[PDB]
Amino acid sequence: FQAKHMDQPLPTAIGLYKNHPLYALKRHLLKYEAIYPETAAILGYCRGEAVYS
DNA sequence: TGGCATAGATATCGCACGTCTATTATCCTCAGCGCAATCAGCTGTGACTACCT
C-alpha cells in the first residue's frame, strides 16, 4: 500500500496540500508548527507554492 | 478547405464570515499580631508599739 500510494496521484490543488503531511505546504502550517529549510529546500510546486517534507 | 479569435459554460482559489476551549500567575476568611482608660498589686510613708539605756 505504501509503495502504491507514495505520491501516486500527484495532486496540484492548493486546498489539497492543506492538512496533508505527505506534502506539508509552508503556508498550510500552524502558528506553532514550522518547516526546516535545512532538510527541505524544494520537493514540488502547486500554483507557485513550494513543497517541504 | 483550414487558422483561431470570442464568448458560453464551470468550476476554483482567495477574501471574508460563524464558533471554541484554553503555550499560562485572583477573591474572600480566620488566626496571628498591634493600640488606649480601669484596676489592682509592688513599693514607699506615716501611725502605733517593742526594746536598750
Short mmCIF file of C-alpha atoms (C1' of nucleotides) in Angstrom, two decimals:
data_model
loop_
_atom_site.label_atom_id
_atom_site.label_comp_id
_atom_site.label_asym_id
_atom_site.label_seq_id
_atom_site.Cartn_x
_atom_site.Cartn_y
_atom_site.Cartn_z
CA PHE A 1 0.00 0.00 0.00
CA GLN A 2 2.83 2.41 0.82
CA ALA A 3 4.54 1.65 -2.49
CA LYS A 4 1.30 2.15 -4.42
CA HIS A 5 0.29 5.37 -2.63
CA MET A 6 3.71 7.05 -2.46
CA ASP A 7 2.87 10.31 -4.28
CA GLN A 8 0.88 8.43 -6.92
CA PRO A 9 -1.99 10.90 -7.66
CA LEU A 10 0.40 13.88 -7.59
CA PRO A 11 -2.28 16.46 -6.69
CA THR A 12 -1.67 20.09 -7.62
CA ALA A 13 -4.63 21.81 -5.92
CA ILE A 14 -3.86 24.38 -3.23
CA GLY A 15 -6.61 23.10 -0.94
CA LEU A 16 -5.38 19.51 -1.20
CA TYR A 17 -1.92 20.45 0.10
CA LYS A 18 -3.51 21.68 3.35
CA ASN A 19 -3.57 19.25 6.29
CA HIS A 20 -1.63 16.67 4.26
CA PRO A 21 1.71 15.63 5.80
CA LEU A 22 2.81 13.91 2.58
CA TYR A 23 3.07 17.42 1.10
CA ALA A 24 3.28 19.83 4.08
CA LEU A 25 2.89 23.19 2.36
CA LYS A 26 4.66 26.06 4.09
CA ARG A 27 1.55 28.26 4.11
CA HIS A 28 -0.62 25.35 5.30
CA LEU A 29 1.18 25.06 8.66
CA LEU A 30 0.15 26.28 12.12
CA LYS A 31 1.38 29.06 14.38
CA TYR A 32 3.48 26.61 16.41
CA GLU A 33 4.48 24.27 13.57
CA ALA A 34 7.29 25.36 11.28
CA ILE A 35 9.27 23.96 8.35
CA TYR A 36 13.00 23.19 8.34
CA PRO A 37 14.67 24.70 5.24
CA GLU A 38 17.91 22.87 6.10
CA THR A 39 16.35 19.50 5.25
CA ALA A 40 13.69 20.86 2.87
CA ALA A 41 14.58 23.21 0.01
CA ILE A 42 12.10 22.17 -2.72
CA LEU A 43 10.13 18.98 -3.34
CA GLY A 44 7.34 20.21 -5.64
CA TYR A 45 5.15 23.13 -6.57
CA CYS A 46 1.45 23.94 -6.73
CA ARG A 47 0.32 27.33 -8.09
CA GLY A 48 3.58 28.92 -7.02
CA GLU A 49 3.55 27.15 -3.64
CA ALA A 50 6.62 25.17 -2.60
CA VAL A 51 6.55 21.71 -1.02
CA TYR A 52 8.60 20.68 2.01
CA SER A 53 8.81 17.35 3.81
"C1'" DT B 1 -10.68 23.72 -47.46
"C1'" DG B 2 -8.38 25.48 -42.65
"C1'" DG B 3 -6.01 29.07 -38.68
"C1'" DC B 4 -8.06 30.87 -34.38
"C1'" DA B 5 -10.32 34.55 -32.12
"C1'" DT B 6 -14.59 35.25 -28.89
"C1'" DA B 7 -17.58 34.22 -25.82
"C1'" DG B 8 -20.61 30.12 -23.45
"C1'" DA B 9 -20.06 27.10 -19.71
"C1'" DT B 10 -17.67 25.82 -14.84
"C1'" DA B 11 -15.58 25.30 -11.59
"C1'" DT B 12 -11.60 27.49 -8.35
"C1'" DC B 13 -8.92 29.88 -5.16
"C1'" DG B 14 -8.97 33.96 -2.23
"C1'" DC B 15 -11.23 37.19 0.97
"C1'" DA B 16 -14.42 37.33 4.37
"C1'" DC B 17 -17.86 35.48 8.00
"C1'" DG B 18 -19.83 31.99 12.11
"C1'" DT B 19 -17.84 29.14 16.56
"C1'" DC B 20 -14.44 27.02 20.97
"C1'" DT B 21 -11.60 25.83 24.70
"C1'" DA B 22 -7.57 27.36 26.55
"C1'" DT B 23 1.63 27.98 25.26
"C1'" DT B 24 -0.12 30.06 31.21
"C1'" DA B 25 0.31 33.97 37.86
"C1'" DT B 26 -7.45 36.02 41.53
"C1'" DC B 27 -11.14 36.88 45.65
"C1'" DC B 28 -12.96 36.46 50.43
"C1'" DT B 29 -11.67 34.30 55.72
"C1'" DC B 30 -9.57 33.17 60.20
"C1'" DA B 31 -5.70 33.19 63.10
"C1'" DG B 32 -1.55 35.88 64.48
"C1'" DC B 33 -0.04 40.46 65.80
"C1'" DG B 34 -0.59 45.69 67.35
"C1'" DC B 35 -3.19 50.12 70.25
"C1'" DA B 36 -5.86 53.37 74.73
"C1'" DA B 37 -8.95 54.26 80.28
"C1'" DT B 38 -9.66 50.90 84.58
"C1'" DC B 39 -7.88 48.34 88.27
"C1'" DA B 40 -5.17 46.14 91.04
"C1'" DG B 41 -0.73 44.82 93.29
"C1'" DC B 42 4.59 46.35 94.45
"C1'" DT B 43 6.66 49.68 96.91
"C1'" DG B 44 7.03 53.98 99.69
"C1'" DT B 45 5.42 56.67 104.05
"C1'" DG B 46 3.12 57.61 108.29
"C1'" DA B 47 0.85 55.83 112.82
"C1'" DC B 48 1.38 52.54 116.65
"C1'" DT B 49 4.25 49.84 119.73
"C1'" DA B 50 8.84 46.76 121.20
"C1'" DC B 51 13.50 47.04 123.34
"C1'" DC B 52 18.45 49.04 125.24
"C1'" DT B 53 19.85 52.59 128.11
#
